[PDB]
């Protein structure tokens, strides 16, 4: 099994939320979202880091405007998606729908699945 040093840490979850709040490229879209779509954003920041997610300007813009389909289509074109497509497809469904369909849940259990 995984080393204890390599497991999911609640504090790293909290670091992702802090990172969102203190980045003007992230907090406005987070604030605009419902709780389930917020979990998708937390996941993405947890995985690739604050700076990286803040680079997704076009797609976050779409999310902030409730343009769910356009956001999902755009996110699936990224290098991120092609790197980790199973995970990205789950996160994208969560952004698109505001449901846990892709995990059938809460942010911790979502990450517990995605981190493996
Ligand atoms: Cl994957």
Swiss-Prot record:
Record: residues binding substrate: 46, 59, 74
Induction: Expressed late in the viral replication.
Single GO MF descriptor: lysozyme activity
Phenotype when changing residue 59 to V: 50-fold decrease in enzymatic activity
pH note: Optimum pH is 7.3.
Outcome when changing residue 74 to M/F: 2-fold decrease in enzymatic activity
Disulfide bonds: none
GO cellular component: host cell cytoplasm
Origin superkingdom: Viruses
Matches recorded under SUPFAM superfamilies: Lysozyme-like
Reported effect, residue 115 to Q: Complete loss of activity
Annotated phenotype, changing residue 59 to I: 500-fold decrease in enzymatic activity
Alphabetical UniProt keywords: Antimicrobial, Bacteriolytic enzyme, Cytolysis, Glycosidase, Host cell lysis by virus, Host cytoplasm, Hydrolase, Viral release from host cell
Compartments where found: Host cytoplasm
Effect the entry attributes to changing residue 59 to F: 10-fold decrease in enzymatic activity
Annotated active site: 115 (proton donor/acceptor)
Presence of keyword Isomerase: no
BP terms from Gene Ontology: cell wall macromolecule catabolic process; defense response to bacterium; peptidoglycan catabolic process; viral release from host cell by cytolysis
Alphabetized InterPro entries for the sequence: Endolysin_T4_type (IPR034690), Glyco_hydro_24 (IPR002196), Lysozyme-like_dom_sf (IPR023346), Lysozyme_dom_sf (IPR023347), Phage_lysozyme-like (IPR052619), T4-type_lysozyme (IPR001165)
Family per record: Belongs to the glycosyl hydrolase 24 family.
Record's protein name: Endolysin
Organism lineage: Viruses, Duplodnaviria, Heunggongvirae, Uroviricota, Caudoviricetes
């Amino acid at each position: 099994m995984k080393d204890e040093a390599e497991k999911l840490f609640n504090q790293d979850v909290d670091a992702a939320v802090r990172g969102i709040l203190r980045n003007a490229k992230l907090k406005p879209v987070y604030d605009s979202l419902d709780a389930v779509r917020r979990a998708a954003l937390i996941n993405m920041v947890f995985q690739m880091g604050e700076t990286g997610v803040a680079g997704f300007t076009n797609s976050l813009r779409m999310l902030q405007q409730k343009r769910w389909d356009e956001a999902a289509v755009n996110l699936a074109k990224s290098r991120w998606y092609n790197q980790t497509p199973n995970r990205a497809k789950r996160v994208i469904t969560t952004f698109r729908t505001g449901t846990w369909d892709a995990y059938k849940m809460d942010i911790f259990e979502m990450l517990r699945i995605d981190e493996g």
